[PDB]
């Protein structure tokens with residue numbers, strides 16, 4: 273549940289990603305795969321290598337996805353319906369993995385957006401990412 | 414996020430609780446205090462002896478709040494906003510304690526309403542109480 | 555861990571458990587209530603529905619094995635670390651099951667005990683069992699510590 | 700925990716640039732802001748009503764420095780983190796009753812603070828190494844519970 277403030281924070285913080293959506297997305301992944309290798313078990317069809325255009329391009333959609341999740345923040349279950357099916361029904365992603373990706377995304381934001389990663393914004397982003405994580409791991413069709 | 418079958422499961426199951434709501438609240442409360450003694454530190458002014466009158470009055474309030482969440486299962490944040498203020502702002506309950514109490518609520522239902530506690534109803538009730546717990550531990554005012 | 559009156563409580567109740575049924579119901583309910591665990595069982599076939607899951611013969615057979623594990627934990631509450639030392643290796647080092655799932659299974663078994671024994675599963679009996687299942691999940695996760 | 704010699708080198712170079720009188724307080728303040736129920740353990744600390752109050756709170760800054768000092772003790776004793784934190788564990792699990800999920804949280808907040816301070820220098824390899832460290836510390840701090 274985000275306060276009105278939380279949504280302005282994520283709106284404001286996540287907007288500054290901008291063209292770098294791809295880049296931050298890919299790095300967050302790279303961060304997760306190196307820091308938490310078990311998460312590779314979900315991507316055996318990917319090229320794990322650093323700089324791998326499959327990782328790089330996948331990151332672009334997660335960021336858009338999240339941009340879209342920021343875009344339908346108060347409609348997120350309807351808006352993330354397809355990704356729920358993918359992640360909860362089809363892939364069966366264990367929910368801890370969302371906490372790992374969520375942390376790597378925060379690390380990336382902290383590393384690339386220091387002026388915007390204030391404590392208030394950090395807390396809003398964590399709740400936002402937890403909210404996206406709850407939607408993606410729940411079967412509600 | 415509760416599915417449509419989730420919502421009808423919860424509502425039909427709660428109906429069968431009926432007049433025993435307060436009784437099951439107090440038992441879940443006792444189970445929790447005995448099974449997880451650290452939770453008692455949230456009730457230092459409560460006489461926590463077996464058969465305690467404070468635990469029984471309090472079980473009724475909890476049951477009534479859950480019954481109200483069932484009635485308002487589509488607008489839970491709004492309908493529980495005073496209880497989130499209490500639990501998230503003033504009490505600052507660790508979310509782990511909501512999992513302990515939800516688990517004890519399920520144990521109580523499984524003990525008193527075995528016909529209703531199907532696997533599917535179990536799944537639906539679990540998400541519902543996880544949902545309530547998310548509202549009550551979020552600061553969104 | 556268990557005081558005398560506790561051990562005798564859990565002992566007595568565990569005597570009445572159907573060892574060809576409750577193990578299977580706990581596993582099946584794990585797979586239903588916490589569906590992402592299904593991922594660990596694409597070998598087991600039909601897990602599409604609650605009724606499909608709860609009747610899967612391998613789900614039942616496997617559940618017998620886990621209740622067997624629990625039976626073995628109850629036997630040696632002295633040193634479940636060593637008791638489950640081999641299982642911990644399989645669950646942690648080999649299959650990489652997040653240990654929160656260990657806690658979830660124990661709580662489901664506890665539910666399933668309450669579901670079967672009803673009023674006999676008193677708050678004090680649950681409390682002793684909660685110590686037991688936490689010991690099994692801990693011991694099971696020893697290779698993570 | 701076992702870091703590769705290059706992880707150890709990268710970890711120690713970054714750490715040597717850590718502001719030992721601030722980072723500890725940033726990490727604790729963020730814990731209390733991002734995970735507001737942890738404030739329950741610090742009602743002795745005074746004003747926590749707002750994020751700026753949390754971060755500016757002298758008691759927070761104070762207590763954060765000693766926490767940073769333990770993470771330092773941990774870094775110097777990576778092969779024996781249980782021993783190093785044996786008494787600390789007694790304090791956090793037996794006396795305080797802190798649910799050990801929160802130890803993972805602080806460790807991950809610290810990583811976010813290291814990222815904040817070091818930017819690009821806090822590369823994914825470097826992060827990978829520190830995740831190893833803070834996982835180590837949290838569990839040695841949780842050891843009693845094992």
Ligand code: HEM
Pocket residue numbers: 311314315330333334336337338355358359363365369370373401404405408
């Ligand atoms: C915030 C968390 C996440 C978001 C927003 C997210 C978003 C997305 C998006 C947008 C897609 C592709 C949609 C499309 O087909 O156009 C996708 C695919 C995928 N996501 Fe996620 N995801 C998240 C977390 C995870 C996690 C934690 C995992 C696994 C550990 C995961 C695994 C996948 C996989 C395996 C795919 C499919 C890859 C492919 O074959 O293209 N995702 N995700």
Ligand code: HEM
Pocket residue numbers: 452455456471474475476478479496499500504506510511514545546549
């Ligand atoms: C879904 C779970 C819960 C529900 C529905 C719930 C509901 C309530 C309700 C209705 C009240 C009293 C409201 C009032 O008097 O104005 C209350 C108070 C309280 N709750 Fe909860 N609660 C839940 C979980 C928890 C948990 C897990 C804890 C702690 C372990 C907790 C601790 C308290 C405390 C300390 C009070 C105030 C007691 C008093 O002074 O009378 N609650 N809760």
Ligand code: HEM
Pocket residue numbers: 591594595597619620623624641645649651655656657659660690691694
């Ligand atoms: C928590 C208490 C648990 C106990 C006591 C337990 C015990 C066992 C036992 C006795 C086996 C049989 C070894 C064999 O197949 O030869 C086993 C296998 C397995 N367990 Fe567990 N287990 C537990 C929890 C879990 C959890 C949480 C998961 C994952 C969600 C899991 C997944 C498996 C899998 C996938 C296998 C092997 C499957 C196969 O043989 O095809 N277990 N476990």
Ligand code: HEM
Pocket residue numbers: 737740741743765766769770787791795797801802803805806836837840
């Ligand atoms: C995860 C790594 C953690 C480390 C390294 C750590 C470290 C320490 C240290 C070094 C002390 C000081 C002991 C002394 O003064 O003699 C301490 C005290 C304390 N820690 Fe932690 N801690 C950790 C986690 C936590 C968490 C998660 C909480 C609460 C959520 C917590 C709450 C406290 C409190 C309340 C005190 C002392 C209270 C007081 O003196 O006023 N700590 N910690």
